[PDB]
Amino acid sequence: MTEYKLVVVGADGVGKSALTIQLIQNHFVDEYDPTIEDSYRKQVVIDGETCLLDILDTAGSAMRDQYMRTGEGFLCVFAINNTKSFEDIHHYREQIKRVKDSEDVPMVLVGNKCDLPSRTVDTKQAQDLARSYGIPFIETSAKTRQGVDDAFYTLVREIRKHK
Ligand SMILES: Nc1nc2c(ncn2[C@@H]2O[C@H](COP(=O)(O)OP(=O)(O)CP(=O)(O)O)[C@@H](O)[C@H]2O)c(=O)[nH]1
Ligand SMILES: CN(C)Cc1[nH]c2ccccc2c1[C@H]1NC(=O)c2ccc(O)cc21
Ligand SMILES: [Mg+2]
């Protein structure tokens, strides 16, 4: 079966771990336990194809160069109530594009914490940025699990399209 190496990137606190844990364990992590590095495996069925997801959950370096080279697809995560994390997105995309020496790298823009009321990043703002990059935009909530499977499965489909 096909294996997909996915990397979850973004500013410290956007919900990279909570999104990953919701995907893998169907569990919401309320606590804020900072990540050094953690990878997870999950067998899933996407478009009738049973495949293996190998997901790397990163810290919000030679180690960074290595996983960006290895990573087939990237979830660029920001929190919808955090303008600073949205402003950070281009820095992550720039690092990945530089390491992979490609303007065509499978990526998905993820607007997390969509369950929270005081939103500072509009859907239009996020959609316009994702459109300028030629990538999908998915609104997610690691709290309710809204859009979690969508973000990861969409990334897998972007990888399938690329190859
Ligand atoms: N309400 C709400 N809270 C969230 C959501 N996602 C994450 N959180 C909360 O934000 C905090 C940080 O989440 P975490 O997943 O640890 O973020 P992170 O980006 O991995 C932090 P680091 O970069 O240090 O590894 C946690 O308290 C978590 O419960 C969400 O979608 N909605
Ligand atoms: C192979 N799996 C058991 C673990 C795993 N899953 C991934 C998903 C996306 C990208 C990389 C990886 C890796 C590792 N492969 C590396 O090159 C690397 C560098 C730094 C790390 O912290 C981890 C890895
Ligand atoms: Mg984390």
Numbering used by the authors: 1 to 60, 65 to 167
Please share excerpts from the published article on this structure.
The 3 human RAS genes, KRAS, NRAS, and HRAS, encode 4 different RAS proteins (KRAS-4A, KRAS-4B, NRAS, and HRAS) which belong to the protein family of small GTPases that function as binary molecular switches involved in cell signaling. In the “off” state, RAS proteins are bound to the nucleotide guanosine diphosphate (GDP), while in the “on” state they are bound to the nucleotide guanosine triphosphate (GTP). The γ-phosphate of GTP holds 2 regions, switch I and switch II, in a compact conformation that allows interaction with downstream effectors, such as CRAF, PI3Kα, and RALGDS, as well as with the allosteric site of SOS1 and SOS2. Oncogenic mutations in RAS impair GTP hydrolysis, leading to stabilization of the activated GTP-RAS form and enhanced RAS signaling.
Based on the X-ray structure of 15 bound to GCP-KRAS, we chose to introduce a phenolic oxygen as a H-bond donor at the 5 position of the isoindolinone to interact with E37. The 5-hydroxy-isoindolinone 18 was 6-fold more potent than the nonphenolic matched molecular pair 17, with an isothermal titration calorimetry (ITC) KD of 20 µM. X-ray crystallography confirmed the desired phenolic H bond to E37 at a distance of 2.7 Å and, all 3 previously discovered polar interactions to D54 and T74 were maintained. Given the improved potency of 18 and the high conservation of the SI/II-pocket across RAS isoforms, selectivity was evaluated using ITC, and 18 was found to bind with similar affinity to both the GCP and GDP forms of KRAS, HRAS, and NRAS, including both mutant and wild-type KRAS. Compound 18 also showed biochemical inhibition of GTP-KRAS with SOS1 (EC50 = 33 µM) using a time-resolved fluorescence energy transfer assay. A dose-dependent decrease in phospho-ERK levels was observed 2 h after treatment of NCI-H358 cells with 18, leading to almost complete inhibition at 50 µM. Guided by the X-ray structures of cocomplexes, we were able to optimize binding, as evidenced by the discovery of the isoindolinone 18, which bound to GCP-KRASG12D at 20 µM by ITC and also displayed inhibition of the key PPI with KRAS in a similar range.
